[PDB]
Amino acid sequence: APVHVDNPYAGAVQYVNPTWAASVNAAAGRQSADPALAAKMRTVAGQPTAVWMDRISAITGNADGNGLKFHLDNAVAQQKAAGVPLVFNLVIYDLPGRDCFALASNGELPATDAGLARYKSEYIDPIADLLDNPEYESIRIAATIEPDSLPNLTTNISEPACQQAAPYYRQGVKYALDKLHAIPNVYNYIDIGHSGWLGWDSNAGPSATLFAEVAKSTTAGFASIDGFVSDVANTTPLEEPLLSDSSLTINNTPIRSSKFYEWNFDFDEIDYTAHMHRLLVAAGFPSSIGMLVDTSRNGWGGPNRPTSITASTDVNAYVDANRVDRRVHRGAWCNPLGAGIGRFPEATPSGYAASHLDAFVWIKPPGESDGASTDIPNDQGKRFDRMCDPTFVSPKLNNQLTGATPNAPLAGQWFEEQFVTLVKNAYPVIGGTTPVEDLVAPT
């Protein structure tokens, strides 16, 4: 009933998930021997993260969460206490043939008509039925729409699983957008990958065109999509502070031709969001579209972060000494070693006008694994993806090891060592929070 706004984050607070906060606080308690680190973890626990509907069972509740209604009810209470609008971040993530480029069957719904019928009736419909309840008119929902989906159709269509998934990604995203856009307090942010996947002109361009086709297939057209979100569950840095000029040439050799960048001009997500905003508008979207970056794990801080330019005559040595992204390769999506927490969630961050940023958000919740690092038997029926395997030399990474973090649990499970590293390596640094009872000398 309230009017639908251009940017639901402006002047708003964001939902804080008490279940994830409790997981963070438990991790902090396990750092009793390192009280300064525990204090930083306590600060992290106060930050807003998205709630993932990563399977049908998450709607009513499962071993990983208490159900969607629990969060919506919590969000209305948090909005009342804030006295300003509140955005509840929700991830829509269950397409038939999900994650078609993974060499594994990662999605619970197969890429078949039966899978699509279940996506519509047992996944989207119950979510929309809850979101449309008049009980929730007092909150805003920012729905991140299907990470790791549509751009596979323009970059990874050589994989048969992506060919099979293609009609279901198009029809499933259309259905999600149609059902969710009909709810006036829902704001749809289409996932746009990240610069290490789509920054090349040959990938960015066709992706923007495909997003416009999807928009035009919906009943409301371009109005169905409020904005776009990059870097979800990835680690590509917000900015490369030392490599700020991707056109720099050293002795007639472009630094973008380095092994790490593979001729891509987009070294970071600020540049990528500016690039995609341009292309999306040119493809038919209104200039009012806004962008989000998932800053949950893209900080690349800690002692390994370069602090000044190391001089070199060789483009690879120059890039490798000066990049803050310390991954083996920008395609390393599964628990890459050394990642740190990035900027805290924030409405309308300043200083990046061309990126048209509605907010920085934590879509992936820091501490949750991207996937298991070995083929562990499990009561989720989840399957093993070698991109999470520290032993795997991946063709997707120019024949290099994944650099994945070992001893990783299933996706969504708490990853103890990874969270320690994420907090230690945060950029900006994290300040500590100390409860009042711990300010007195213990007696």
Residue numbers in the entry: 1 to 443
What do the authors of the reporting publication say about this deposited model?
Cellobiohydrolases (CBHs) play key roles in degradation of crystalline cellulose, which is the homopolymer of β-1,4-linked glucose and fundamental component of plant cell wall. High hydrolytic activity of CBHs against crystalline cellulose is achieved by the unique structure of the catalytic domain (CD), which consists of tunnel-shaped substrate-binding sites covered by loops. The unique function of CBH is a unidirectional movement on cellulose surface coupled with processive hydrolysis of the cellulose chain into cellobiose, the minimum repeating unit. In contrast, GH6 CBH from the bacterium C. fimi (CfCel6B) has CBM2-CBD and three fibronectin type 3 domains (FN3s) as a linker between CD and CBD.
We solved a crystal structure of CfCel6B CD with 1.3 Å resolution, to clarify the structural difference between CfCel6B and TrCel6A CDs. In the determined crystal structure of CfCel6B CD, we confirmed that the Val43, which is close to the N terminus of CfCel6B (without signal peptide) and mutated to Cys in the single-molecule fluorescence imaging, was located in the opposite side of the catalytic site. Overall structure of CfCel6B CD was similar to that of the TrCel6A CD except for the additional subsite and loops. In the crystal structure, CfCel6B has additional substrate-binding site (subsite) constructed by Trp303 at plus side, the same as TfCel6B. This additional subsite is stabilized by two loops (shown in blue) which are not found in TrCel6A. Near the product-binding site, a pair of exit loops has been also found in CfCel6B and TfCel6B. The exit loop 1 (shown in green) was capping the end of the substrate-binding tunnel. This exit loop 1 of CfCel6B is 4 amino acids shorter than that of TfCel6B, indicating that the tunnel of CfCel6B is more open than that of TfCel6B. In addition, the exit loop 2 (shown in cyan) of CfCel6B showed more open conformations compared with that of TfCel6B. The Ser105 and the N-terminal loop of CfCel6B, crystallized without ligand, stayed outside of the cleft. The slow component for CD, which was not found in TrCel6A, has been observed in CfCel6B. This result strongly suggests that CfCel6B CD has higher processivity than TrCel6A CD by the additional subsite and loops observed in the crystal structure.
